[PDB]
Amino acid sequence: MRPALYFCGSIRGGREDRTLYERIVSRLRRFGTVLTEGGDRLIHEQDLEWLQQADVVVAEVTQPSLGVGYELGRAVAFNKRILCLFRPQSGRVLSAMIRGAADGSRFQVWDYEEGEVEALLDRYFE
Amino acid sequence: RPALYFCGSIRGGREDRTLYERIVSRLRRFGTVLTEGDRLIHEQDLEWLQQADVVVAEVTQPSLGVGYELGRAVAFNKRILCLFRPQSGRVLSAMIRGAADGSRFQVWDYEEGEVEALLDRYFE
Ligand SMILES: O=c1[nH]c(=O)n([C@@H]2O[C@H](COP(=O)(O)O)[C@@H](O)[C@H]2O)cc1CO
Numbered sequence: 001m002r003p004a005l006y007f008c009g010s011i012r013g014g015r016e017d018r019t020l021y022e023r024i025v026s027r028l029r030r031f032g033t034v035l036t037e038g039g040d041r042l043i044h045e046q047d048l049e050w051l052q053q054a055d056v057v058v059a060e061v062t063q064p065s066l067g068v069g070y071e072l073g074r075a076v077a078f079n080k081r082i083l084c085l086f087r088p089q090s091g092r093v094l095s096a097m098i099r100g101a102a103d104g105s106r107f108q109v110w111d112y113e114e115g116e117v118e119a120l121l122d123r124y125f126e
Numbered sequence: 127r128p129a130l131y132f133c134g135s136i137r138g139g140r141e142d143r144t145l146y147e148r149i150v151s152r153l154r155r156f157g158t159v160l161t162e163g164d165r166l167i168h169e170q171d172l173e174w175l176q177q178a179d180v181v182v183a184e185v186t187q188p189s190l191g192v193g194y195e196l197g198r199a200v201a202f203n204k205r206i207l208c209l210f211r212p213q214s215g216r217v218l219s220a221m222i223r224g225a226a227d228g229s230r231f232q233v234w235d236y237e238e239g240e241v242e243a244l245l246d247r248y249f250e
């Protein structure tokens with residue numbers, strides 16, 4: 001009944017939002033098990049195992065990242081429930097591939113202000 | 127003729143725009159280049175991706191849309207060629223480097239001056 005959760009955020013794209021990712025994961029742990037807590041081959045394979053196990057995939061999509069985009073594309077194809085979180089105050093324009101993938105139900109993209117992330121997650125998960 | 131889908135950063139940044147033009151110009155010699163509001167962009171691109179025979183991505187500039195295209199392409203069972211420049215100083219995403227299997231999903235490091243010769247070798 002408590003969901004398994006998969007979190008996505010930029011790493012090699014840049015760690016600008018690392019503190020925010022820690023806040024997101026701390027809040028997700030209140031609701032479920034966060035599965036995400038060659039060398040790169042092991043990372044890919046283990047992440048893909050967890051992605052298929054996840055009940056919800058949550059991605060912070062403000063910092064551009066190949067790996068986050070790839071995770072989202074694989075997740076869509078696995079028909080996962082997906083929540084993407086984007087901060088327009090960053091001054092970026094979110095990728096059309098992510099904004100345009102939203103169908104408002106199984107794949108949602110929410111624009112938000114950084115201070116409100118915990119409350120937003122509360123509204124989505126309760 | 128073989129149908130080719132090219133991927134490269136746009137909203138991730140257009141730093142490598144000139145290089146993308148060079149790649150696309152060369153790809154036109156080998157096949158149909160399918161990729162010569164946002165919902166329409168996504169839907170049209172996904173239609174073309176589904177119709178592709180080979181997906182070619184320049185993965186040096188980090189980009190959500192390029193990563194998403196590559197994830198969808200894997201699930202659509204497409205042949206994939208990724209091109210990365212170490213001269214950028216970046217460490218390429220583990221999700222892209224680690225998705226490679228050396229045959230149907232290949233990731234090549236390259237130097238900008240050699241991109242035309244690399245593509246000639248890949249497309250014979
Ligand atoms: O070391 C890593 N570990 C990892 O899980 N990822 C996954 O890939 C996304 C980041 O991708 P990226 O920004 O690095 O390209 C994250 O959401 C992670 O789940 C990537 C890297 C190093 O690449």
Ligand SMILES: O=c1[nH]c(=O)n([C@@H]2O[C@H](COP(=O)(O)O)[C@@H](O)[C@H]2O)cc1CO
Binds near residue numbers: 190
């Ligand atoms: O306006 C657009 N048109 C488009 O085709 N893409 C596709 O998505 C990738 C770039 O993604 P991105 O850098 O913007 O996130 C490219 O390979 C394109 O095929 C994206 C945008 C604007 O998003």
